[PDB]
Amino acid sequence: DAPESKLVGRVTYQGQALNLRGTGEAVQLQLYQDGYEKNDPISVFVGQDGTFSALLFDGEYRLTTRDGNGPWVNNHESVTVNLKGHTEVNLEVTPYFMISNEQLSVTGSAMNASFMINRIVPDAKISRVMLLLSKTQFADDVNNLYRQDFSDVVPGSVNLSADISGNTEIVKAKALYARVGVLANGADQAIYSPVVRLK
Template sequence: MKTISYFSLILLMVAASACSKKDNYDPPKEQVNGAILYKGDSIYLEYNRVPYQFYQYGFGKVGPVEQTFTQSGVISSILFNGSYKFIVPNGQGPFLWPKTAGGAPDSLDVTVSGSQQLNIEVTPYYMVRNASISAGGGTVSGTCKIEKIVTDANAKDIESVTLYINKTQFVSGANNIASASVSGADITNPDNVSLSVSIPAITPAQNYVFARIGLKIAGVEDMIFSPLFKLNF
């Protein structure tokens, strides 16, 4: 008798848990991939620093799906089909984001139907061009050209240019083992900025480092970077 009642109880639980499909959504599955670009060129950013948001209206309360660009400015989100508004929040990123007349950041309409590519064109204040970084003799040296893109009333000065090296591929002001910097005022020829930094002892030992050149724009919090280099030595 007892065995039967336990058995029926378990059966009931199994049945209850098996048939609750009715009130659940399928998970989102449409892959939206892309990057933030300037005239087709990648904009390199700091890891986990520059956020972007998707808003979808029509479901009552409004809140964004927020993520951050990767170091190489890549967007990667999984969404439901539908129409969204895409935005980079105010004051984020080393680029000019379109604004409304009121000064608030303007949003882009994005319609998701199936997996798709989403490339966003923006105007960065500067670009770090022709970067070349090499290692040798315990030193990492890099050169680059700084191209000033925004030259109108919104133009900003260079605060500093810094060569960062790190043990891992995350290379930035917050993640580095050594850096060398030149301030904007000391840059005489923006077409040829060269920097070098000596490689400190690394524990545990490894025979490679990652390096990037970052440009800090005066009055803008987020830096813009050169592509990432992996250097063996």
Template sequence: MTKIKLIILLGVVVGFLTSCEWDNYDAPGSMLQGNIVYNGEAINVSYNDVIFELWEPGWQLDIPIDVTVDQDGSYSALLFNGTYKLIIPSAQGPWRNNVNSTTGSDTVLVNLNGDMNLDIEVEPYYMIRNAQFSASGRDVTATFQAEKIITDAGARDIERVNLYIGKTQFVDFRGPVASAEIGGGDIANPSAISMTATVPSLTPTQNYVYARVGLKIAGIEDMVFSSVQKIDL
């Protein structure tokens, strides 16, 4: 019985010391931040939908750190210093990943030693250009151009374009107060697209809305968007 008590006591002590050692680890203190870009221009996406992964070789847990891309194409992550492999999974984003000159693949090596700004270059299938929004009464009109970036054998068609209008600056296909849609086959001129949606009465009363346009690429889950614009009604 005494031996059993001694074993239990030793187990408690070891567990306590291990817990203390774990608690004494420094918190991550280096900020990695930047944008997902094409030729230096941030690519707008839907809110909280697109991620990339950071892998730290040699760490005990062989699982990635998921970093979420904000709707304006920016990201940030508080990390420990170290060398990370940055990977954008193939199913993420309305783009095609670039081949990195250092790794010879779409993996990017990140050597983090203090705060770091890093823009991640990708190749989008399309970019939305010159998006303009105007209001007449409660009708909101958007005009824009859909520029096809990838034109080789990997090119894809436009499935549809959408105008989304919301009460807050987080605007996409989730719960807009008004929207409009044009199918890809119905777009007469990708360089002159126009869409209009009527904003209903809002409760509580609000004399402004937020709007953006999005483009759905055939066979790609994530849409590419314009930036969000506030519109007075």
């Protein structure tokens, strides 16, 4: 009916893609269009690696975060998109925390996780830190085979060990993936490390 094109994008911080919950419509962005035709915003769901893709009608769009949704300041961050042919964009946000220098491993007895939690927003506080394992490439606070929360972690160097002994599902798993998550006080979603395949 009208020219259509693929829009590909990423949510980033200082140009680096964010690691998020990419399942269950956990993290969404909105695409707005201003014109005669009173077009409602289009919802786009962000993946685990912070990417999104949409087949849309060619035109001018305003890509923004959804109010109060995501592990970042509720600043209504936005970017103008001129969609004509295959187009790629990024959207800069301000995360509460960033996870870096991750070292994730499993023994027969424990999941060991060493990493750094960097505070980006000066008054942000950590609500919980999560150690996760999954049988699949998808791992998050809902989608996992094993989850252990830590509620007294502060920013800086972190060294955690979660007891996975006696967990038959981990022993049975043909493939095993690990991830860590950090949820800020007042946020609806955590920030994560990349998913690491352990077996």
